Design a protein around this nucleic acid. Structure first.
Ligand SMILES: Nc1ncnc2c1ncn2[C@@H]1O[C@H](COP(=O)(O)OP(=O)(O)NP(=O)(O)O)[C@@H](O)[C@H]1O
Ligand SMILES: Nc1ncnc2c1ncn2[C@@H]1O[C@H](COP(=O)(O)OP(=O)(O)NP(=O)(O)O)[C@@H](O)[C@H]1O
Ligand SMILES: Nc1ncnc2c1ncn2[C@@H]1O[C@H](COP(=O)(O)OP(=O)(O)NP(=O)(O)O)[C@@H](O)[C@H]1O
Ligand SMILES: [Mg+2]
Ligand SMILES: [Mg+2]
Ligand SMILES: [Mg+2]
Lengths: 308, 308, 308
DNA sequence: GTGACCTGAGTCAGTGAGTACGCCA
DNA sequence: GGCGTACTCACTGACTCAGGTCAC
């Protein structure tokens, strides 16, 4: 957490610091991730303070050509502890690749919210369970968040108390504004919420309800792309696992197809697939990942705890 | 391959040469390549100083009319870094020419970063396997550069695990402005070396999330043109391949076209479309190349690297 | 044509002829075309000197009216260069005409470079079959010169060998001032030897990438007008077939119009819109030509060249 | 042979750029 | 297999002539 408040000590005007904090941006990394074009439109920042803040931000962080040795060493802060029920974290080697946009693009009845609760609990798994991690956020656009499931999966992982594992943000969207403000206040600049989980339950569901037809596609997807960029910037800020879900559409043209299309196809790092099949048990895929190979898995929910 | 300070050794004022060095010109070609307008825009340079700088620059480097057979004998050595797949480096004649800019685009899960990952390693190779006898300076904006592959690459090529990572230069470049900036830092830090492959993985991932909406589109494409022209400058200046990769959007008629419009369409020399095929096997196509004919590959993304 | 120092040997003092030799006036036709306002601003020459050199040049070069009947005699023996395709041949009424500016624009992968490459070899074919029997100059601005593709054309028509790469002269413009300066250097290489093609592989790519905004819009259109003026001077004093190449831009208001605006739109006698057709086969439609219809035709790019 | 004085009058336009964005049984 | 809508960007500079009137 290297925020705009620590930027004050660098010699930056306090008034401009607060007038940037009142905007979306909250950290030196945030402005260093935005052009001069985005800084030019903040009222009270006029074409000179923006540039000098750009130079100060560029000098403050080592945002230059490295050799990636340090990048592999930074891989150590990143843990994939998605245990689930069976064959998670073994065949699906990367369940939570912190710093990457995991995307459970799946189907109804195939346990996307259930696995989201599992993921939220596992991101709170202590150091003894293969690494201890924090928790910062949960978006509930479709209004399906039952912390009773959190308690049930807590008992699965050996957690007696689930109120400690109660996710720090039960925010909801109600519309396409993707909960603008929480990305801004919850920039996770405190001492907690480091290597946390940022769940967006049905991130682009509301983009389907509110935004409608071809007449609103451009605005819908540009809003979506700005939102996904905000997610990616949040992930780049320290390290956080951006785990989102998504629903399928039906290809009447002549069986799942992306919703959000190529914006979410390219934005998300490790995109994922879920299937029901036969019996109670359901199948997944390992689908997109620059590191993992295509494969399938095998899992089932229980009442006293859930896998995938 | 002649450092800019050598013009000072000719007799040009030391203050002028250093102020040009921090002006974005780090080779005797950098000053010669640009027009007088950019040199004039530099602080401390008048019209006369710029004119004498241009004359002394044109004195050294041959800006003349060499017959096409001279260029053909220059074309005997092209290096043509191999791809790793027998069919892929057969569709490409010998590979990809060094000294021209190549672009790879496709939908998700098409192995653009896979081709980059298994084609940058093939540059720090003896020419016996179509190597380049150079290094890499992979630049990557989305963080698709997952280090697990980055250190699981080297088991097939015949090289140790130490001298693959130690021969790449990775930064992030999480801005539209940071792309050209990183190009400048790369030029000034790699003039004193012998590189064979500069990779700009996602040239246009950052020209969507950043410059949102029309009206803001023209500045987006002007910045893209600036970046692409400086990119092309690194080809004549250092004789390297500068492979970039692209993305797609749904061309809603009311399904596959590259982003960047007609600015990335023209600057690129060779354009490769990667598409998911029947099963794990991929399909590559020659979209837009000056010498290469249109044909399809069938390369398969294997664990060691792109094979067939 | 006659070189600059022809009447000077018995006329003006050789010193001022060598003084104006730096100003890029390497033929007495060029001095004839010269405005007095553009000769007062060069060093050495006074009012009386400028007037006397202009009177001498006007004595050497015809300047007034001429009955269109005799100019029809000139136009009946001009040479039209074969394009390399049989169907493009009749479409362009004998192919690319000489002594005038021709401009083919289009999106990528439309074969604009490919037609120029085949034009560079068909520049040397005999008078009974090919275009002008002369050395082909290839001022190139994108680096997409492929001598290999030149050869494949040489196998056809039975002019194989590197004897076609010796005739072709290849420059490489690196900016706008230099692309303009290269026409001063190219000015003297055509008064001493026969050249029959003035391919500027992209007339406007560097204008697009050099002058950034709207503040530079008046400047760049002025400079481009000057460049097209010297192009027209070359075309109408050497009788070379200038073949410039234009890119495209996308209309956002409502769909691909060429870049350059009302300057190059008016100042490019013949315009072609090459468009991709189906498969490997592309289409060439006429856009703006004062003497041939606005139809559209067919062609394709093979491993041999741009033929059927 | 001696002996300086007095400011008026405005002008004349030019240059286009730049695509995005899936949907539904 | 019948489905549309979205707008903002700016800098440019060189220019000349004209005179004529007196007494102590
Ligand atoms: N506690 C449980 N025990 C066993 N099976 C369960 C349990 N909870 C849910 N399930 C099963 O898992 C499915 C959950 O599907 P899920 O995709 O999470 O629901 P949804 O309504 O599609 N939510 P979302 O996809 O986030 O919009 C249910 O339909 C049941 O078949
Ligand atoms: N070890 C491996 N063995 C086999 N296949 C692998 C292996 N690692 C990666 N792959 C495959 O390579 C594919 C390419 O990854 P991909 O999703 O294209 O990365 P990306 O190019 O960064 N994504 P995008 O930007 O959407 O193209 C994966 O989906 C796997 O199918
Ligand atoms: N040997 C060949 N055989 C057949 N077709 C070929 C061959 N070489 C190139 N082509 C075709 O020519 C196309 C390229 O045309 P080109 O003239 O390079 O377009 P351009 O618009 O000038 N390129 P850019 O630099 O992106 O503007 C390729 O996409 C192929 O379709
Ligand atoms: Mg469900
Ligand atoms: Mg890919
Ligand atoms: Mg071309």
């Amino acid at each position: 957490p290297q925020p705009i408040s620590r930027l004050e000590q660098c010699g930056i005007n306090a008034n401009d610091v607060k007038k940037l904090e009142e905007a979306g941006y909250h950290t030196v990394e945030a402005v260093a991730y935005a052009p001069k074009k985005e800084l030019i439109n903040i009222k009270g920042i006029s074409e000179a303070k923006a540039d000098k803040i750009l130079t100060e931000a560029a000098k403050l962080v080592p945002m230059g050509f490295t050799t990636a040795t340090e990048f592999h060493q930074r891989r150590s802060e990143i843990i994939q502890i998605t245990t689930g029920s069976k064959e998670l974290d073994k065949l699906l080697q990367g369940g939570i690749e912190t710093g990457s946009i995991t995307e459970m693009f799946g189907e109804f009845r195939t346990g996307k919210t259930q696995i989201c609760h599992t993921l939220a609990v596992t991101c709170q798994l202590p150091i003894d369970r293969g690494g201890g991690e924090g928790k910062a956020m949960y978006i509930d656009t479709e209004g399906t968040f039952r912390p009773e499931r959190l308690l049930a999966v807590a008992e699965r992982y050996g957690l007696s108390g689930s109120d400690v594992l109660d996710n720090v943000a039960y925010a909801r969207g109600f519309n396409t504004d993707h909960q603008t403000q929480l990305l801004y206040q919850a920039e996770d600049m405190m001492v907690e919420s480091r290597y946390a989980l940022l769940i967006v339950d049905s991130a682009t569901a509301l983009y389907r309800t509110d935004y409608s037809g071809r007449g609103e596609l451009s605005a819908r997807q540009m809003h979506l792309a700005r939102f996904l960029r905000m997610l990616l910037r949040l992930a780049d800020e320290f390290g956080v696992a951006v785990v989102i879900t998504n629903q399928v559409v039906a290809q009447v043209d002549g069986p799942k197809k992306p919703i959000g299309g190529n914006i979410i196809a390219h934005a998300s790092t490790t995109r994922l697939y879920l299937r029901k099949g036969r019996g109670e048990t359901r199948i997944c895929k390992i689908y997109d990942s620059p590191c993992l190979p295509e494969a399938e898995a095998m899992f089932a929910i229980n009442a006293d705890g859930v896998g995938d």
